[PDB]
């Protein structure tokens, strides 16, 4: 009782004691100095590494360039960046382009608008709980959030196609600059959740009343949102015509609905690409699910097939080698440099002050200190010529050319093994073991609630 | 009282985690304690729970000079990171042996100063302890040089006129009933000290009590939702 | 011969052996990750020390206040902002004052002058020595610089006087940015060193030629120089009248010399100030002479009483106590933090690296180390109760309100006897026993070669 709680007290003698004790060490007076003066990651830089580290020849690449580097700015679009930045090289290549973008700004008006719609829903679906219910708390949260994943990128070009850049662009402040039009989207949600809670303790969910009630509510919210962008200025199955010129500076005009330019110009074809995930705390040839998880209403629940890191990385050098960017999600920024745009677990020397990291993948998961937070495009890796084996990748970052080399990033295999959670691949690029888990009769995914780790969404 | 704040957070979440060992790791409140468990802020109980124990010091002994005191986010980060690690390894000493065990005994001191030492590393702990003595030579308005010699628990009363036993925090929670006391379940920052209570109280009472206090020529320290509604450029 | 000669070698195996053995340190590894990130004294900067050392509370000042602060920018006149500092406090007491300075830039175009002509003379006094002799290239180096000391500035004033900036200021481009002005006239004077020289192999000195010459090359500089800065409005014995303002907003004028206002307002006696110094590698209470150093042709020659720090400092906390500043030189910017104003041997964490210095300051003076490169002024200092001792020292240094705190800076007592080498006093401000080696029958000065390190400028 007494004794425990006052042996496992801060007791000041101890402290100035191993204080003194501290202070006769040499390194340990060398690094209180440097640490009382510059951050620990400006300090710890290792340039011995870095001078290592930092390679950008890449023998394994896909042939078309990146051009330009986008810039999300200040809004959590990465999955949408990345996943567009895959399928963009496509048209480059295809329609002879020195520049091209596919409209990131189109996905991003309708994933906010339908995520809105979602949670208006998931309240009316959760309204038998009590409001500090850990699920009601975590709707209410960040309802209108900007990110997300590629299942709820399939669910958007799914139902809204893609559009070429100069059609919609990210004229609107809110695209560069999305944190007051969320803030204001929300406390009218967070209004909206209370008003349909109200009602729903008196009705039933059908009923005129709440049927009519959110319609109003989801009236409001469109009418809020086009205040910030324009709604898109071509149906889904509604033609435009681009103009463009290549190359060669000939101009030539494509005629075509936002779903026929997805598949026909991006040459996406929305039922084949699936998400793998590497989460050590489940067993591998899972199929991992995460409650509630969405983005439009009723579209594809979000579901992982779990994988270790040998067949991902497999994975990754065979889509580069056919010729295909490899869309993935990190821990950004944890171990990378912007600067150089370097991406190492060891470029700082962390050793040196004694400070050493031994808790593993799995454990840094559940114990709450690793995830995915964003989201970039593998354009090339190395493979070396003796081990065969992919020593480091080439990255695509979306934060403008000025970021990490030009734009691009380079990162160690055993980042992409540590730091990162998950790659997007085509169902037929699997090994037919891992691609029946998903055609087969199910598999029965592990269920996991929407504040798993593992939920997290890509910025 | 940054410097003491941080050190008491890292240890009072050791314990914390010993006390909730018994929960899943993905509950809510073993993930709660896992989010920020060194984070910067605070509240007024905290607040008294370190002068009580430390009292206070003219900035001229110790001031904002390390980098951390004014960029805490990688400090944070790092002392974090160790100490989530940490968590862990009690949790899983903790299904073999009981909380007091020689094991966890020993486990948790050998934390405690692994704690302190990334500590040191980045700020220095005080000059002076509680209760030691400490010179400050200052300046007054008529440029007369004066020196004090005294205790961090002897200024905070002699000097700074703080009596620990006298403030309490008032809060205008409307979802409870006024008049009550709310208190909140293990918020802390000093292990074993002053819990979080409130007294729940309507607007137009704390509206008279400010209006009080200044008339009676003293400040008033409030907690609001910033920055909603406010206009820094011009200070509305 | 070749053993020795392999043995004196680097060696490669060598110091990569010492290099796998330095790695295996600890505070090696990061004493190397920092100091190639950062500057070593930016690195090393000991914020436990400077937490301590940044003390300015000092019980023993001069009553008036240093306003405003003066700044030299990019000249090396400190010499004359230092002197002129230490009297322009008896004009801004005397005539109640908000702000007052003498004019700094008066001096500086006297002395550019002056020495130009003496560079002159003194190639005429050694015409008979080679062109690569150790004087003739020295004395070619840098005729027109900039810095002094204070023999050369009392030697300016009992010619010239002194008189308020308000007549004559910086305005002009050459006061604040000086080099490319000497730069200019140095060239031209080489050219004058060569003419006269090769003149002199066929006369003598005193021959029409020769004078015819001289006085042609002393009219060609003085046009150069009234290019870059006007001759001051007013000659030395010549009346001129200031008009300005008190504190209280009361107009005055003043019809004054700048003979008499040098002695009538800024209480300057020409006849009792002298130079101590502070010079291990001689005998304490001897006279020290520069040959040929100087200004002013046949003026003063520099002479220094060597005296010990315990003397030294004594007087200067007399001179202090008396409110009298103190005009000091030092070897700037040697272990001084500018941006914190601290001047303070320990306030940078070189034991940790393992860096230590045993050389004393004779042998420092004499390994082409340390020697006097700046004039400052000391305003105040700190007088332990306890010990009776000064701690530190208040001063105004001239480099802009913005350098150090508000262009102050705090000097340790051991900083000053480490790192300082000068200080003027009174001859009535010392013990007789001293006094008397200047009065007395001269003593016999140690004479030290003009590119002896005592004989070194304050810029």
């Known amino acids: 009782a007494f004794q425990g709680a006052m042996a496992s007290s801060i007791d000041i003698s101890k402290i100035n004691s191993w204080n003194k004790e501290f202070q006769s060490d040499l390194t340990h007076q060398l690094a209180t100095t440097v640490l009382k003066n510059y951050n620990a990651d400006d300090a710890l830089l290792n340039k011995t590494r870095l001078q290592k580290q930092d390679n ?8 078309t360039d ?23 090289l496509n048209v480059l290549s295809e329609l002879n382009l020195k520049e091209f973008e596919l409209s990131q700004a189109y996905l991003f008006f309708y994933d906010k608008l339908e995520k809105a719609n979602y949670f208006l829903d998931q309240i009316v679906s959760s309204a038998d709980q009590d409001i500090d219910s850990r699920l009601v708390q975590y709707l209410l ?32 402040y809110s695209t560069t600059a999305s944190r007051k039009w969320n803030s204001l989207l929300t406390t009218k949600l967070r209004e909206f959740a209370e008003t349909l809670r109200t009602a729903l303790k008196e009705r039933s969910a059908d009923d005129s009343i709440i049927v ?31 103009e463009y010129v290549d190359k060669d500076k000939k101009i030539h005009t494509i005629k075509s609905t936002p779903l026929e330019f997805a598949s026909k110009y991006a040459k996406l074809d929305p039922s084949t ?65 912007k600067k150089t745009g370097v991406m190492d677990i060891e ?39 003796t081990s065969k084996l992919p ?35 085509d169902i037929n690029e699997l090994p037919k073991e891992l691609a029946s888990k998903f055609t087969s009769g199910k598999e029965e995914p592990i269920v996991l609630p929407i504040w798993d780790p593992m939920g997290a969404l890509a910025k």
Chains 1, 3 share one sequence.
Request: net charge positive; proline share 6%.
């Open 141 to 172: 949260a960040a309802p209108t959030e900007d990110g997300g994943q590629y299942s709820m990128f399939l669910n958007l070009v799914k139902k809204y196609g893609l559009i070429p850049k100069d059609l919609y662009g990210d004229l609107p």
């Open 391 to 425: 020593l480091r990748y080439r990255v695509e970052n979306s934060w403008g050319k000025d970021s990490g080399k030009d734009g691009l990033y380079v990162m160690t295999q055993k980042y992409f093994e540590e730091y990162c959670f998950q790659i997007v691949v």
């Open 56 to 63: 950008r020849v890449f023998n394994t690449v896909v042939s």
């Open 347 to 385: 470029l700082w020397n962390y050793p040196a002050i004694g400070y050493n990291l031994p808790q593993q993948k799995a454990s840094r998961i559940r114990y709450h200190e690793s995830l995915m937070t964003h989201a970039m495009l593998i354009t090339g890796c190395h493979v070396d010529e």
């Open 273 to 337: 690409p699936v998400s793998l995930i590497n989460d050590p705390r489940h067993p591998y040839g899972k199929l991992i699910k995460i409650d509630r998880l969405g983005n439009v209403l009723g579209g594809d629940a979000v579901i992982y097939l779990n994988v270790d890191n040998e067949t991902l990385s497999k994975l990754v050098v065979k889509r580069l080698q056919n010729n295909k960017a490899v869309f993935f999600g990190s821990h950004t920024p944890k171990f990378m440099d």
């Open 212 to 242: 009519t009630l959110r319609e109003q509510m989801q009236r409001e919210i469109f009418r809020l949102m086009s205040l910030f962008m324009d709604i898109p200025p071509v149906q889904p199955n509604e033609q435009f015509t681009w």
């Open 66 to 88: 990146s051009t330009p580097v986008t810039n999300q700015k200040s809004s959590g679009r990465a999955w949408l960046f990345a996943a567009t930045n895959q399928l963009r």
